[PDB]
Amino acid sequence: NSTVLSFCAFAVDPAKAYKDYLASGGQPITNCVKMLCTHTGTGQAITVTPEANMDQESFGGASCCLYCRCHIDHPNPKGFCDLKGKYVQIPTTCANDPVGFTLRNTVCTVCGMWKGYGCSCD
C-alpha cells in the first residue's frame, strides 16, 4: 500500500505496528474492496455474502485482513483466516479504516455481531 504494508510485515507484532503507525499520523490501509449491496442484510460481522444493514458497509474479506494484505502468517493456531473468501460488515462511521476495525474488534460468539456496535447482549 506504500510503506504501511512493509512497515507491518517486518514487525515482530504486525498489529501493534499498525496501531503505532496510525498513532504517528499515518493513513489507514487503502483499497479495501467495498461491495455494492442492498443495505437490507442481517448486519452480522462476517458472512458468506454481503449482509450490510443501513448502518454498515460490506467489504470483500481478504482485502480487510492485515495478514492477507501484508502477505504474512496469520496468528491463528494453524494458518486459517476468518476473513478471506467472506464478506465483512463494517460500521459506516468506521469504513475509512476496515483493516484497523477488524484488528481492534471482536465478533460476539452468540449473535454474530461486532461487540460494542451491532451486538446487544447481556
Partner: protein, 287 residues
C-alpha cells in the same frame, strides 16, 4: 433513458452482420469517471454490471459450478472483480482466479504466474477474463500472447453448455477468439454503462457447442465492433448499480452429464443451446 437503466449495451445484430473495413477507434480508454459511486472501485462497478447483464442470458448453473477468472489481480494488489464474482455466484461454487503478479483474493484458489503456466485436466462452466497488456505503435493486427492460451483453454477446457466473458479493447483483441464466438449458441460484445466511453468490451459467448454454428471472420468482426463504437456514442451510466435486490445468479440446478461424442445428437445440442445442460466429467478438481 431506457438504455441508461441497463447495466450496459450489447452490440446490435445489425452491426454484427456488416463487413466493415478496419478503422481507428475515436474513443479513449482512460478518463475521470463521474458515474462511479463514492468509495466504489471502477472494477467493482464494471464486474457488477457484467454480472447483471449475464443474469439476462441463459447461463447453465449446475449445483457444483466451476468458475475460473483470468487477469484477476490489480496494481492495488487486491481482486475487486473476484469479490464481485464471489458475491454473484451460488455459495460453494468453485472459484479459481489467476494473474501474472501476486495479489490477495477471496477465491478458493489463486494461481500466480503467466496464464500459459496454468494447467488443469478438469472442465469449467464459466470462464471470465480481464487480461490486458498496456503494451500498438504502428498497425492494429490480431494480438497473440494470452489470447492464444485462452482460445486453446476454451477449446480444451470449457464444458459444452458453458459460457465465457473475455475483455477486449480497440488494440487488445484476437481474430481466433472472435471466430470461436461462432461456436456458441449466442454471442455479443457487451459494453458496461459505467465504462462506456472506453473502447473496452466483453466478448460474451453463451452456451458452448464445441462446433461452428456460424462462420465468423475475426478481422472483419473486430472492424464491425469498432464501427459500432465509432457511430454509437454511449453516455456513462451507473443507474443499474442502485438496485442490487435481484443480483445473485439464479440457482438453476442445471443437469451435468458425461456424454460420448456419439451420444450428443440433435435433441442434446438443443438442450445445450437453451442453457439446459452441461456436458463434462465430475472428477476432483486440480488446478
Amino acid at each position: 433513458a431506457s438504455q441508461a437503466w441497463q447495466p450496459g449495451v450489447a452490440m446490435p445484430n445489425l452491426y454484427k452482420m456488416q463487413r466493415m473495413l478496419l478503422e481507428k477507434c475515436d474513443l479513449q480508454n482512460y478518463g475521470e469517471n463521474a458515474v462511479i459511486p463514492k468509495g466504489i472501485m471502477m472494477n467493482v462497478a464494471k464486474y457488477t454490471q457484467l454480472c447483471q447483464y449475464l443474469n439476462t442470458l441463459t447461463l447453465a448453473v449446475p449445483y457444483n459450478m466451476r468458475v475460473i477468472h483470468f487477469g484477476a489481480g490489480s496494481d492495488k494488489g487486491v481482486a475487486p472483480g473476484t469479490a464481485v464474482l464471489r458475491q454473484w455466484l451460488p455459495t460453494g461454487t468453485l472459484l479459481v482466479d489467476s494473474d501474472l503478479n501476486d495479489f490477495v483474493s477471496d477465491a478458493d484458489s489463486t494461481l500466480i504466474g503467466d496464464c500459459a503456466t496454468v494447467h488443469t485436466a478438469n472442465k469449467w462452466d464459466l470462464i471470465i477474463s480481464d487480461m490486458y497488456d498496456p503494451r500498438v505503435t504502428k498497425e492494429n493486427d490480431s494480438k497473440e500472447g494470452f489470447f492464444t492460451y485462452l482460445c486453446g483453454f476454451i477449446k480444451q477446457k470449457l464444458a459444452l453448455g458453458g459460457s465465457i466473458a473475455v475483455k477486449i479493447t480497440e488494440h487488445s483483441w484476437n481474430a481466433d477468439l472472435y471466430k470461436l464466438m461462432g461456436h456458441f449458441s449466442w454471442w455479443t460484445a457487451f459494453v458496461t454503462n459505467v465504462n462506456a466511453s472506453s473502447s473496452e468490451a466483453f466478448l460474451i459467448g453463451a452456451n458452448y457447442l464445441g462446433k461452428p454454428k456460424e462462420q465468423i471472420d475475426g478481422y472483419t468482426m473486430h472492424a464491425n465492433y469498432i464501427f459500432w463504437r465509432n457511430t454509437n456514442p454511449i453516455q456513462l451510466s451507473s443507474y443499474s448499480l442502485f438496485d442490487m435486490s435481484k443480483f445473485p445468479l439464479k440457482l438453476r440446478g442445471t443437469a451435468v452429464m458425461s456424454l460420448k461424442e456419439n451420444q450428443i445428437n440433435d435433441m442434446i445440442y438443443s438442450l445445450l443451446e437453451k442453457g439446459r445442460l452441461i456436458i463434462r466429467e465430475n472428477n476432483r478438481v486440480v488446478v
